Ligand binder design. Sequence first.
Ligand SMILES: *[C@@H]1O[C@H](CO)[C@@H](O)[C@H](O)[C@H]1NC(C)=O
Ligand SMILES: *[C@@H]1O[C@H](CO)[C@@H](O)[C@H](O)[C@H]1NC(C)=O
Lengths: 104, 104
Amino acid sequence: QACKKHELYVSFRDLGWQDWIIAPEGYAAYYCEGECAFPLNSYMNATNHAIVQTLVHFINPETVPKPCCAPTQLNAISVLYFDDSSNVILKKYRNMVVRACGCH
Amino acid sequence: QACKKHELYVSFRDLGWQDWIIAPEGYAAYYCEGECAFPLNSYMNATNHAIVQTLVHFINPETVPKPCCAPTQLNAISVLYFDDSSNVILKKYRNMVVRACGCH
Ligand SMILES: *[C@@H]1O[C@H](CO)[C@@H](O)[C@H](O)[C@H]1NC(C)=O
Ligand SMILES: *[C@@H]1O[C@H](CO)[C@@H](O)[C@H](O)[C@H]1NC(C)=O
């Protein structure tokens, strides 16, 4: 239940992009989820600011929430599609995949 | 109630650091909080991955949570303190202050 990376496959059919994409038919997108509380194991990649916020939360929970589990690194995907003039084009979409998460 | 930056002053006395710090007596730390849902106004600095995750959440909420509001930029502070041999030293602590937030 601690902050970590999870699996998530995204199908272009579910989003309604199947019409003009030639390949791939979907991709492994992943997602960050879980608690950012003590112990802030090093693997959880907390910043100094997160350590401070988690301590403040411990001292008076009304003053500030716990940090949130979020992506610390992302990578692009490339898709092959047909434009409106029937051209076949390769398009790069940046920040589409989660590679690592942390309490930031 | 949307994702934005908030005020948070942190006093070294509340954390028990007053013993050896010469200056300052605390600092403006800030914190990110709020919802990451449509509309993802541009000011909310969402990544492509967050847009995709928010859409997936809209299509079946059981599959994935909404993105979380987290810091996108942080700055260091410098403190003046007395070490165990009574030396006066200037120490820099990185990633201590939140400057901007987003749905990441
Ligand atoms: C924290 O970052 C490192 C990158 O060195 C990564 O390998 C690790 O998986 C990250 N932790 C989590 C929980 O995603
Ligand atoms: C999003 O990032 C920009 C930096 O260009 C920043 O000025 C803005 O305040 C950020 N938004 C929020 C809600 O913090």
